[PDB]
């Protein structure tokens, strides 16, 4: 998998962020998880072992950075927020 690319289409963008948020809102209301295996791993961009709106916020912010200054890789951007 590529971290941040939860729809596995080779792009990190707002559709990844909306997808993580949608999964979080479903799980929050008690529906079963749809993100399993490498999808679940791709969603957990800050590596805190949970999928929540902080991951979705991070993907969206990367999408916006890559759309502007575009001066950091997605992997380096998500590592800024991962546990030492």
């Amino acid at each position: 998998y590529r971290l941040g690319d939860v729809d596995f289409n080779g792009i990190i963008d707002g559709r990844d962020a909306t997808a993580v948020l949608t999964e979080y809102a479903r799980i929050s209301t008690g529906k079963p998880a749809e993100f399993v295996g490498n999808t679940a791993l791709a969603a957990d961009v800050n590596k805190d072992n949970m999928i929540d709106a902080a991951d979705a916020t991070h993907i969206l912010t990367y999408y916006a950075i890559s759309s502007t200054r575009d001066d950091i890789t997605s992997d380096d951007y998500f590592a800024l927020h991962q546990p030492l």
Partner: protein
């Protein structure tokens, strides 16, 4: 000074003429009577969507303005502030981009609403003159790593048709130019709104 940064909408589908949902984005066209009325004014520029109530979830597009305008940042430093169209969208982010900003949104369902998506405070320079047009541009950009968006939560066939409409027909560009006289005079018919000052010549 503004340049035409927009790109040709080239995803499949690129013809949104048959979209169920035809989103149109309007941008403030502020006109001052005299240079003295305009000089040093801060104008709230709204980016207002119509025809897509409850039809969208995921957005991302570029905004640029004439370099002579001074953006007045929010308290966080952001050049754009979300509006009422995005109040039911839990994800909303603005990233600064020189004489411009990138604005993006996300939602856990099709909670996108009609109305003001974003606002930008733009200040008219002290040496503004009668006749000046400060154009404001909404633009599509793409590169192989990512592109601009206006789709539904599932990113459905209809959401991709709606996106195609938004970028090709919903906003002005070099392929869908403005006929507004201020932008024609500005040689910026690719742009979408403006702050203008009347020339007031017979």
């Amino acid at each position: 000074m503004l340049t035409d940064r927009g790109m040709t909408y080239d995803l499949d589908p690129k013809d949104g003429s048959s979209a169920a949902t035809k989103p149109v984005l309007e941008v403030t066209k502020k006109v001052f009577d005299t240079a003295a009325d305009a000089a040093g004014q801060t104008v709230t520029v709204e980016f207002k969507v119509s025809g897509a109530e409850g039809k969208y979830a995921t957005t991302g597009y570029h905004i640029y303005w004439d370099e002579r305008l001074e953006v007045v940042a929010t308290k966080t430093g952001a050049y754009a502030k979300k509006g009422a169209a995005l109040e039911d969208s839990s994800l909303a982010k603005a990233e600064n981009n020189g004489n411009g900003v990138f604005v993006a949104s996300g939602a856990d369902d099709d909670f996108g609403a009609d109305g003001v998506m974003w606002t930008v405070e733009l200040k008219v320079p002290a040496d503004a003159k009668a006749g000046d047009v400060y154009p404001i541009d909404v633009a599509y950009q793409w590169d192989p790593s990512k592109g601009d968006l206006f789709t539904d939560n599932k990113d459905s066939a209809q959401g991709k048709l709606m996106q195609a409409y938004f970028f090709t027909q919903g906003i002005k560009s070099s392929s869908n130019p403005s006929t507004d006289e201020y932008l024609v005079k500005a040689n910026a018919t690719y742009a979408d709104g403006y702050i203008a000052i009347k020339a007031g010549e017979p």
